Amino acid sequence: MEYRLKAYYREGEKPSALRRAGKLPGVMYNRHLNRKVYVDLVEFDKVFRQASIHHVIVLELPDGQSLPTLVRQVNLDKRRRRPEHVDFFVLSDEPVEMYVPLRFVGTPAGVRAGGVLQEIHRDILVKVSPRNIPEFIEVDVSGLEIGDSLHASDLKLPPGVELAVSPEETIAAVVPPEDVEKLAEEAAA
Amino acid sequence: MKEGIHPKLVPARIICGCGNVIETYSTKPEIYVEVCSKCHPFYTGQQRFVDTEGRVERFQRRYGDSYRK
Amino acid sequence: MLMPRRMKYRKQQRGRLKGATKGGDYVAFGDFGLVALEPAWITAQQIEAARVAMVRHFRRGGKIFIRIFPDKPYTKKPLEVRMGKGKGNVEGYVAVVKPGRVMFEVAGVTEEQAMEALRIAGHKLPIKTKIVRRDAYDEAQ
Amino acid sequence: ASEVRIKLLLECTECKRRNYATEKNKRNTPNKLELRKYCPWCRKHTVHREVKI
Amino acid sequence: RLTAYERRKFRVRNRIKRTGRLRLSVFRSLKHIYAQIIDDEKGVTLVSASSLALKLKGNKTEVARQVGRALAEKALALGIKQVAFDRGPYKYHGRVKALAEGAREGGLEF
Amino acid sequence: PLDLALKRKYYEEVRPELIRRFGYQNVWEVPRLEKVVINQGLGEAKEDARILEKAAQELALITGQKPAVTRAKKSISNFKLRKGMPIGLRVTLRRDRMWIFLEKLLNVALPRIRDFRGLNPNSFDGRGNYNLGLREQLIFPEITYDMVDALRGMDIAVVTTAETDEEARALLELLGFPFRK
RNA sequence: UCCCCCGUGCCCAUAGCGGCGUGGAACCACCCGUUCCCAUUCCGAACACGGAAGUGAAACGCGCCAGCGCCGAUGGUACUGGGCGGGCGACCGCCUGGGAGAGUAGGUCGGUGCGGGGGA
RNA sequence: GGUCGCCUCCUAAAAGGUAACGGAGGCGCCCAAAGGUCCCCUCAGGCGGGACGGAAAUCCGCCGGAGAGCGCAAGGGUAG
RNA sequence: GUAGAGCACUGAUAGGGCUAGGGGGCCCACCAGCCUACCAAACCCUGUCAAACUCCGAAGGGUCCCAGGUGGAGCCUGGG
Ligand SMILES: [Mg+2]
Ligand SMILES: [Mg+2]
Ligand SMILES: [Mg+2]
Ligand SMILES: [Mg+2]
Ligand SMILES: [Mg+2]
Ligand SMILES: [Mg+2]
Ligand SMILES: [Mg+2]
Ligand SMILES: [Mg+2]
Ligand SMILES: [Mg+2]
Ligand SMILES: [Mg+2]
Ligand SMILES: [Mg+2]
Ligand SMILES: [Mg+2]
Ligand SMILES: [Mg+2]
Ligand SMILES: [Mg+2]
Ligand SMILES: [Mg+2]
Ligand SMILES: [Mg+2]
Ligand SMILES: [Mg+2]
Ligand SMILES: [Mg+2]
Ligand SMILES: [Mg+2]
Ligand SMILES: [Mg+2]
Ligand SMILES: [Mg+2]
Ligand SMILES: [Mg+2]
Ligand SMILES: [Mg+2]
Ligand SMILES: [Mg+2]
Ligand SMILES: [Mg+2]
Ligand SMILES: [Mg+2]
Ligand SMILES: [Mg+2]
Ligand SMILES: [Mg+2]
Ligand SMILES: [Mg+2]
Ligand SMILES: [Mg+2]
Ligand SMILES: [Mg+2]
Ligand SMILES: [Mg+2]
Ligand SMILES: [Mg+2]
Ligand SMILES: [Mg+2]
Ligand SMILES: [Mg+2]
Ligand SMILES: [Mg+2]
Ligand SMILES: [Mg+2]
Ligand SMILES: [Mg+2]
Ligand SMILES: [Mg+2]
Ligand SMILES: [Mg+2]
Ligand SMILES: [Mg+2]
Ligand SMILES: [Mg+2]
Ligand SMILES: [Mg+2]
Ligand SMILES: [Mg+2]
Ligand SMILES: [Mg+2]
Ligand SMILES: [Mg+2]
Ligand SMILES: [Mg+2]
Ligand SMILES: [Zn+2]
Ligand SMILES: [Zn+2]
């Protein structure tokens, strides 16, 4: 719902060492502050799997100051597909833009027609104050046939929240399966 | 104007079919039309004239229903 | 097969392959993807080979996504000809692949079932591979 | 040059000595050339014409 | 995006600017006509003689001829002889022409 | 600049009904004519015979002005065009010459066509203008019959400071346009 | 000496697009006419002269905000000059100065220099 | 068998230069206007309108910084 | 103007939305219904590839000024 995580400080000491030290490098910032931080890879993992860019992160500091945060961008090392640096957006009252999950619910007709659900977005951009940052947004996908698609505009949108991206953007859809029946004349031409 | 290529438009009258002396400034000293604005099956009302029908369909041809009804 | 239906030039240079991948480093459509661990030239005949494999594994079902597309022309001199007198001829096409790239990812099927149809998929592939799970990290870019 | 494009020496008039030479087309404009050309010989400007090269 | 008006400016403007010699810009509205001598290096004005400051009136062209002659006196007394003529996006003719012929006869040099 | 009765009709009748209609504030923003470009795009004297201007003399007798030609933009095999051939004519009518032309078409020429039935109303521009065309040429008896030859017509735009097609109609209708609908 | 307009540069979109308002006192624009000088491959549209009834609707001047455009760090990574290393090979990694592009946080409806005019 | 001189781009590793029977294309002309200058105009294109007349003949409207054009190939350049 | 990186331009490109055209329906076959688990331009989204694509861009390299630099350095005229 809203997670706390230990944190500390980076003066300038080598990122490469901190990394092999097992402590992840990081940064936190807003519009008034910028601070080099470092967290803890193990602990960070614990939280971030539950949290992602969706829920709230409370950064606990050595000085004992707590901080309301959203992860802004995570850097991944390519060869490994593993953490190497996070941005921590500390929130003021101002309705920061951010991504909240979507909950697809109600099995579509196409999925009972042996189709599949191509949920393109698992999140959604919104302007919304910290005082009411939502979670599961309702999506009623029960009634979409194969090939049919529901867009962006047609959505619950819990009042006090702004559809901060395109109206006719496409959130999810339903496509045909994969017949080996396809494979036949797939070959022909 | 760049003179030496333009037809000198004197004062002139367009004397029409029924009434209407469409007095103008014409390129000819006197031109003559036979149809005018005022009189037209469009300008002034729907206008009857000849246009009333052609093959009246059908009961409006009258004397229909000779038996008992 | 998979020719790029049209192209700006025909014969392409060879090129090195230094280092780690550029992009394609996160799942994006499926819920499980197949990951390259070593550089390669994957071929139109391999991509096709691996694809067909899974399709025939969960017959009628799933949605296969394919993230690398063979655009580079594999060139080769005929047999019993010596060095020079033109540059080789084109036979087949390939897709450059560095380590970290995703190549296949499937969406919507039993966790067991994807974990096979991507396992079998790897054996049709000329390299080392690891199957991966869609991720908070993955949705984080 | 070729054959439709002829080469030519610009002739003269006010002293009849030639002093220039250039190019022209005889399938385009099939006449005799025309340019003003000061001469080092007469020390005056003169209208010139042509003859083959 | 541009109007033919401002293109003509730049055009006529650009050339003259390349020859280094001083610049007698000629501005002209339906009411009055103005002018000012400019060194374009430092980017400064040497002397400005206008129809409005001179408070002249009585036919637009003949108005200007004086304002031109006015500019020459107010500059000769300063040391300028060499100055090339900017005719704005206006055809050199009549009104602008007058300003020139005035500056010309006043002893100014172009 | 000339005593024409349509110039005076626009003022002493058409101007006000418009201010009472769309309730204007300022006086200039009231809809008003601009030009009548008449395009006699013949396309039939290209590398075809002389005689092209044999209409651009009757075209002068209509419009009071001398028409100036239009050339071939680009070459087309299907039309027989080389980039430079003349195909059509165009006169731009500004000031009082513009008026006096309409003071003859709108109430003498438009009815001189057989099977006439008003004007097409969908054909308004979108930013306040309107146009159509015509085929018959002696539709104004300034062009008398024994000037007989092959009949050709004209494309005609009329240009106004109207800001939408809506109000625009109100102008052209108020200055005598029979509309088919 | 602050303010406002007009001219004209310098800067190179943080200046622009679009939007809301707006100013005719003076300047400026539209504007009045087409006799004259000048002009239209047709037209006083432009360019041109002669003026001054109207109007700031257009254009323009000035204000307003971030829909677009645009500028956009810090942290980190890529790559890398120099120097080394373990692999049978493919390729990887280490010290050392250098260090992006994308992207995030954000910035912006300008800043100005001489001349002229006009009220503090 | 192919090639042989000149031009454009790439190879060429951010000055120049750089090989191969390396990947690609052009030249052996043309113009008394396509040259000089002084003057004026601004595109390709897209949407609406447009008697013939169309995907595009000529026309009108907003739209647009250069994606058109600049004799021919390509590159750089180019509406200030 | 390279490595990187990027997609603003020339092109490639896989899924999705939109959507001219095209095809299968089929209503019907005079024009017209506009319906399509089929194809598919231009466009929008996610996601990518390029020696002859670059909105961007390193380290580096070139070179001129200043300073260090007395070296089997350097510079000019000549003989082998
Ligand atoms: Mg570092
Ligand atoms: Mg949880
Ligand atoms: Mg790495
Ligand atoms: Mg449907
Ligand atoms: Mg009478
Ligand atoms: Mg192998
Ligand atoms: Mg000689
Ligand atoms: Mg300056
Ligand atoms: Mg009069
Ligand atoms: Mg045209
Ligand atoms: Mg400067
Ligand atoms: Mg606004
Ligand atoms: Mg306002
Ligand atoms: Mg208001
Ligand atoms: Mg106002
Ligand atoms: Mg006012
Ligand atoms: Mg002219
Ligand atoms: Mg002109
Ligand atoms: Mg301000
Ligand atoms: Mg707003
Ligand atoms: Mg913005
Ligand atoms: Mg940095
Ligand atoms: Mg490194
Ligand atoms: Mg060095
Ligand atoms: Mg080294
Ligand atoms: Mg190793
Ligand atoms: Mg902001
Ligand atoms: Mg503004
Ligand atoms: Mg005042
Ligand atoms: Mg050199
Ligand atoms: Mg010439
Ligand atoms: Mg023009
Ligand atoms: Mg065009
Ligand atoms: Mg037409
Ligand atoms: Mg057409
Ligand atoms: Mg070029
Ligand atoms: Mg396809
Ligand atoms: Mg059909
Ligand atoms: Mg339907
Ligand atoms: Mg449908
Ligand atoms: Mg597209
Ligand atoms: Mg690549
Ligand atoms: Mg490159
Ligand atoms: Mg660039
Ligand atoms: Mg450098
Ligand atoms: Mg040098
Ligand atoms: Mg020696
Ligand atoms: Zn009558
Ligand atoms: Zn001589």
Can you describe what's shown?
This is part of a larger assembly, with chains A (189 residues), B (69 residues), C (141 residues), D (53 residues), E (110 residues) and F (181 residues). Chain A has 189 residues and is an alpha+beta fold. Chain A has helices at residues 15-20, 41-51, 109-112, 180-186, and strands spanning 2-6, 8-9, 25-29, 34-38, 56-60, 68-77, 82-90, 97-99, 102-105, 116-119, 125-127, 137-140, 149-151, 162-163, 170-175. Chain A has four helices and 15 strands. In chain A, the strands form four sheets. Chain A has a seven-stranded mixed beta sheet with strand order 1-5-6-7-3-4-2. In chain A, strand 6 (68-77) and strand 7 form a beta hairpin. Helix content of chain B is 0%, strand content 12%. Chain B has strands at 12-15, 21-24. Chain F is 27% helix and 13% strand. Chain F is built from four helices and six strands; from the N terminus they run αββαββαββα. Chain F is globular. Chains in contact: A-C, B-F. The interface between A and C is medium-sized, with 29 and 26 residues. Bound molecules: magnesium ion (47 copies) and zinc ion (2 copies). One magnesium ion (MG) binds at residues 77-79 of chain A. Residues 1-2 of chain F line the site of one magnesium ion. Chain F binds three RNA strands through strand 2, strand 3, strand 4, helix 3 and strand 5. Chain D: Keywords: Ribonucleoprotein, Ribosomal protein.
Indicate the radius of gyration of chain B in whole angstroms. 24 Å
Strand order of the largest sheet of chain B: 1-2
Quick one: which chains have the greatest interface? A-C, 29 and 26 residues
Secondary-structure class of chain B: little secondary structure
List the quaternary state of the chains.
Answer: part of a larger assembly
Distance between the termini of chain F: 36 Å
Number of helical elements of chain F? 4
**Main sheet of chain F, how many strands, which sense, barrel?**
6 strands, antiparallel
Q: Tell me the strand percentage band of chain B.
A: 5-15%
Family (chain A): Belongs to the bacterial ribosomal protein bL25 family. CTC subfamily.
Subunit structure (chain A): Part of the 50S ribosomal subunit; part of the 5S rRNA/L5/L18/L25 subcomplex. Contacts the 5S rRNA. Binds to the 5S rRNA independently of L5 and L18.
GO biological process, one term (chain A): translation
Protein name (chain A): Large ribosomal subunit protein bL25
Jot down its keywords.
part of a larger assembly; 6 chains; D: 53 residues; mainly beta; elongated; F: 181 residues; alpha+beta; six-stranded antiparallel sheet; globular; binds magnesium ion; binds zinc ion
